[PDB]
Every structure is written in structure tokens, then in C-alpha cells.
């Protein structure tokens, strides 16, 4: 149950929530869901010069099946 | 290869690079391991800013611990 072993969901500038999902092995998988469209900035405000996006990971579950789950969020910027 | 399903590794405020990790006696023999590009995060100016850090997002995977991508953390709520 991911929270219990990692803070990042809360300390990220693109913070995310975790949704319970049941079924299968593993029986319970936690999906990540960005809290915001914007990213939270150096003050704690929602900044719309960037966006929160899920980082997806293809994990193999159970014959064999590969499905895509959001592992957490990152912040993307138009500037480079 | 993620690199060509998703673009984010490049456009993130905490951009990352990927590393091939091939193991013959292992399925899936190929896993792509992410590694943050910087200690800091890219800011609005496009510079590395050390008021925040790029950190790897770790995941348990059925085949071990894998770095899937990076997010940016601040010391403030």
C-alpha cells in the first residue's frame, strides 16, 4: 500500500492521490491520480505555466497479462 | 521502449534518462531503468533550480525494484 513506504505523492509539485483497485495476482493495485492540472509552485499555489501528468508503467499481472498503471505524477513545462 | 511511447522524460521539470538493463535468464529480459538528469528541477526560466529536487519514482515489479520516472519535490507544503 504505496503511501506507507513513500512520501512523494504528497511532497511532489505534481502531487497525486492513490485509488484502490481490486480483483487476480496481485489482487490489489494502487492507481495514481494527479490532484491538479497545474503544478504547485515555490509558494504553494497552483501554477498553470505547467501541467501535472501521470507516469504510466506497464506491469505484468496474472495466464500472463500486461496492463498500464499510473505509478505517480510528474510536472511538464513548455520551456526547453 | 518507453522513450517512444512517452515524451515526458524530456519535457519534465525533473527530466530523466533511460538505461537498458538486459538479462538473458529473466522475463521480460529487457527493462528500461530511469535515472534523473539533475539534482535540481527546471524552473520557469529554463534553469536548474535547487530550491527543489528531482527524485526517482520507484516501483515494485513482478519478474524487483525499478525506477519508472522522476518527479520534483519541494521542502514546503
Amino acid at each position, epitope marked *: 500500500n504505496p503511501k*506507507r*513506504s*513513500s*512520501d*512523494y505523492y504528497n*511532497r511532489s509539485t505534481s502531487p497525486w492521490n492513490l485509488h484502490r483497485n481490486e480483483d487476480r495476482y496481485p489482487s490489489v493495485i494502487w492507481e495514481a491520480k494527479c490532484r491538479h492540472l497545474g503544478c504547485i509552485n515555490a509558494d504553494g499555489n497552483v501554477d498553470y505555466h505547467m501541467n501535472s501528468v501521470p507516469i504510466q508503467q506497464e506491469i505484468l499481472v496474472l495466464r500472463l497479462e500486461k496492463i498500464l498503471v499510473s505509478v505517480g505524477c510528474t510536472c511538464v513545462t513548455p520551456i526547453v | 521502449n518507453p522513450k517512444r511511447s512517452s515524451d515526458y522524460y524530456n519535457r519534465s521539470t525533473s527530466p530523466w534518462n533511460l538505461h537498458r538493463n538486459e538479462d538473458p535468464e529473466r522475463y521480460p529480459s529487457v527493462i528500461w531503468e530511469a*535515472k534523473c538528469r539533475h*539534482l*535540481g528541477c527546471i524552473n520557469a526560466d529554463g534553469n*536548474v533550480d*535547487y*530550491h*527543489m*529536487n528531482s*527524485v*526517482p519514482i*520507484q516501483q515494485e515489479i513482478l519478474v524487483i525494484l525499478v*525506477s519508472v520516472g522522476c518527479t520534483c*519535490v*519541494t*521542502p*514546503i507544503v
Partner: antibody
Amino acid sequence: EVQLLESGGGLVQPGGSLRLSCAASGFTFSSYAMSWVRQAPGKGLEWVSAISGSGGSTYYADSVKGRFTISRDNSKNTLYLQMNSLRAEDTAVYYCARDLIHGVTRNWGQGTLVTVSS
Amino acid sequence: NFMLTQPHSVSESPGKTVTISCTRSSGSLANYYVQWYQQRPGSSPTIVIFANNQRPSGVPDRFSGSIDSSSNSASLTISGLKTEDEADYYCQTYDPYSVVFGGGTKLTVLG
């Protein structure tokens, strides 16, 4: 409640070797950079060394480069400092500290005394 | 690397304001967060201020932090000074590789 318990202090011979252990609790250890800070008896605080959450990034003060090695074990919730080729000037209380980000420490341990003497 | 210079001591009577400053030798101060620590004798350092001016729940609001770009220095200020403030105080900051503490400042409460 954040808790950090240093361990493995004692007496070492000059040119000798010692390893410290810090058992952390009260927080998701894997999401925090950690560092060691020392203070010689009656003197100031002196940064020693730091490590990223993953353990894949490593930092040292000029006085301890190549001699010291910082490491960690997130499954065992423990921070380490491996101290090689000790000098009289390494004699200090060694503190375990938790970082919000590299360079920003939010919590300190109670420390452990290292005495490098003959 | 760099040096953080703070006075060896500051002194004021109860009720007053006290300013301990911390000057950064090289590198832009406002590029990096500054932290402040209290050490009461025989005890572990306690944080007072982190990230320039963020105060932990539990630290009285008489303590406050700020930065000064032009003199490349940071300051802790303690209004309404009390005899329980008597202690050592350390400023602290870093750069992309090093973390650096100041030499500490012994605070005395007069009278």
C-alpha cells in the same frame, strides 16, 4: 514522531576504521536524503557527508573525501558511515540528520561520540 | 566551496529585538534555501527556521528569517527576547554539491 538513533561510536586508533549506524523511524525512510554532521568537543557544527533517497547519489566534505563512505539500506531503514584512515581531528559527536531536499535538514539524532586516540 | 560568516556572539536585554546575520562568501545566496538551528548546551541541534522563513509548528513566532540578496547574507531575528532564548545559533545553506554551516553565534540575555 521522527526518530533517529545513532550507534557504533567508541574508541579508534589513529589510521584506523569505524562504522556508524543510524536507525530511523517515524517516516518513509526511502523518500529522504540523509546526511552526517559532526561537532568536535566545544567547537562548531561541520557537515560531513550526504546521500540521496535512492542511495545513488553521494556527497562528501573536502576533509573526508576518499576516507569516508556514506551508504544506506532502505529495507533495513538504516543509514551508514564507513570511516577509514581516521585522524585525531575526526574526534567528534556524529549526528544523523534527515533532509527535505539536498541541503535542508529538518531532523537531528542524539549523536554518538567518536574518539580517535592512541 | 564557500563560507558562511556569522558573529561570534550577540547580546540583548529581555524584551528586545536581536539580529543574527549570516554572510555567504561566494555563490548567490537567494539561489539556495537557508536554515537556522538552535543548540542548547549538551543537546542536539533543534531547527528554528528552514527554507529561509518557514517556521516549524512548535517554534514561537518571535523567531523569523529573511534573506538579503545585495549583501549576500541571511538573517535570523528574535523579537521580544526571553531568557530561554539563550543558546547557540547556526545558519546553514548549501550548493549543488556542498552543505555548509556557519561558525555559530552565542546568544546572551543581559541583566
